[PDB]
Amino acid sequence: PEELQKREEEEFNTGPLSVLTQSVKNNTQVLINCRNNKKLLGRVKAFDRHCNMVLENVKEMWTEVPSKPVNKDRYISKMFLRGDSVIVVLRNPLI
Template sequence: MTLEELQKREEEEFNMGPLPVLTQSVKNNTQVLISCRNKKLLGRVKASDRHRNMVLEKVKDVWTKVPTNGRSKKSKPVNEDHYISKMVLCGDSVIVVLRNPLMHRQQERTCPLRWE
């Protein structure tokens, strides 16, 4: 396989499947929701590769914690979060990458599709 064919194939891979979500996020500086093994990340992708390794900025790290009261009695789960300004995320911990659902809903409300 020549170098040109390899580059063309790699470009096609980035335009098909799940990778366009990442490439569009990098180009448009939009937020994505990333589901990892034990938490969810909401942030902006600055760079990514085909292995789903990512450089993220302005990340909100969210997880669920079940507190215990005294004699190992479980209470209601509590969502906890914290802010990370910049981070590198290893692609093998990524399960799902979605466009920010809240931003997507706002765009649908402001720019509804009209079929005429």
């Protein structure tokens, strides 16, 4: 209801979800350390308690061994990463 929805809003605002809070306020490009070691970069659109992150302008990178690892990197326009695969949520990246 109203108080509980406000409580989830506060969990997004002044909790450990402040990363996604900035990601949805200033639209900071977010690093998404996936559990498969896949690095995702893009602007966020939506957030959840379970760390479900909606993303935009998404780039996906992964180091493939053909050796010498090659950093493959491609684009998915929009993205959606429900809170299962995401290991770490980095608000500000170096790029």
